[PDB]
Amino acid sequence: MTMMDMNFKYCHKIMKKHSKSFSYAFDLLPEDQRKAVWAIYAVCRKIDDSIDVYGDIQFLNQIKEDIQSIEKYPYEYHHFQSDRRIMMALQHVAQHKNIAFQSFYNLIDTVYKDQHFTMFETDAELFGYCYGVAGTVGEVLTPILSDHETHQTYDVARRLGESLQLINILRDVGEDFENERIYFSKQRLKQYEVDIAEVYQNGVNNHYIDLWEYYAAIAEKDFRDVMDQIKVFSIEAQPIIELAARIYIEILDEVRQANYTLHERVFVEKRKKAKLFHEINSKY
Ligand SMILES: C=CCc1cc(-c2ccccc2)ccc1OCCCNC(C)C
């Protein structure tokens, strides 16, 4: 192993630890593409955890300044201030591929603002959050996963990111509530007559199920839009992206099978991921 290989292997560890779903699928990409995904994912994962390192924006600003150094001087040596292995790997990617740096800055801004979290008044605010934490990641991945990106490639990547974040929200209602976060909008909670604290205490009811299903239908439509437009991605990436999206959206059926529980994190076991691989691999 070279020094650079060590950097990418660490990024891989971070991605696989955090997401068995995305690692299962994206590890099937050709070597140079999977390595880029690992680095981008690891940066975004580090951003996600950054406030809790000390309890304030310190580490997140260190990350931001490292990304800014790469943007301004991609071919210069940097004393990185944050996670040196991740930033060395990101820099290596930036030397080979176009990175949408503003999308990282939008992600960072979203994480900063989340310090001051207030419940979303409207679904538009919820979807804006989904853009900030997940559509941004799709934008950064777009040049890795396409040959000739257009406005459509970025639209489709944003839309997939938003589907994936909505699925995360739908899986994690109980855990997020424990952590003082409710992502369903106040407007929709009022319309469906749902109080998450009350549901956390007393279990699901038809009102809650109807609200959950309202959002699930959006995630599913987002997913179908992306599958319909999958030809924006490179031929090698298409079945991998279909696999990632199908594995992740299978979580919705797992939630349903578990009666929409607020008290455990449901999952798609490895053997089921493999079944989806076989179904998609046979298709391609
Ligand atoms: C690698 C998976 C992550 C990923 C992938 C696509 C995508 C977009 C287009 C095509 C293929 C994939 C979009 C958003 C993604 O990030 C979701 C939030 C992750 N947050 C953790 C990092 C905290």
Swiss-Prot record:
Binds 2 Mg(2+) ions per subunit. A third Mg(2+) ion binds between the 2 farnesyl diphosphate (FPP). It comes from the Bacteria. (2E,6E)-farnesyl diphosphate 2 binds at R45, Q165. GO terms for biological process: carotenoid biosynthetic process. Signal peptide: none annotated. (2E,6E)-farnesyl diphosphate 1 binds at H18, S19, K20, S21, Y41, R45, R171, Y248. InterPro entries: Isoprenoid_synthase_dom_sf, Squ/phyt_synthse, Squalene/phytoene_synthase_CS, Trans_IPPS_bact-type, Trans_IPPS_HH. Keywords: Carotenoid biosynthesis, Magnesium, Metal-binding, Transferase, Virulence. Pathway: Carotenoid biosynthesis; staphyloxanthin biosynthesis; staphyloxanthin from farnesyl diphosphate: step 1/5. Its cofactor is Mg(2+). The keyword NADP does not apply. PROSITE patterns: SQUALEN_PHYTOEN_SYN_1. It catalyses: 2 (2E,6E)-farnesyl diphosphate = 15-cis-4,4'-diapophytoene + 2 diphosphate. Mg(2+) 1 binds at D48, D52. Its EC number is 2.5.1.96. Mg(2+) 2 binds at N168, D172. Belongs to the phytoene/squalene synthase family. CrtM subfamily. Involved in the biosynthesis of the yellow-orange carotenoid staphyloxanthin, which plays a role in the virulence via its protective function against oxidative stress. Catalyzes the head-to-head condensation of two molecules of farnesyl diphosphate (FPP) into the colorless C(30) carotenoid 4,4'-diapophytoene (dehydrosqualene). This is 4,4'-diapophytoene synthase. It comes from Staphylococcus aureus. The gene is crtM.
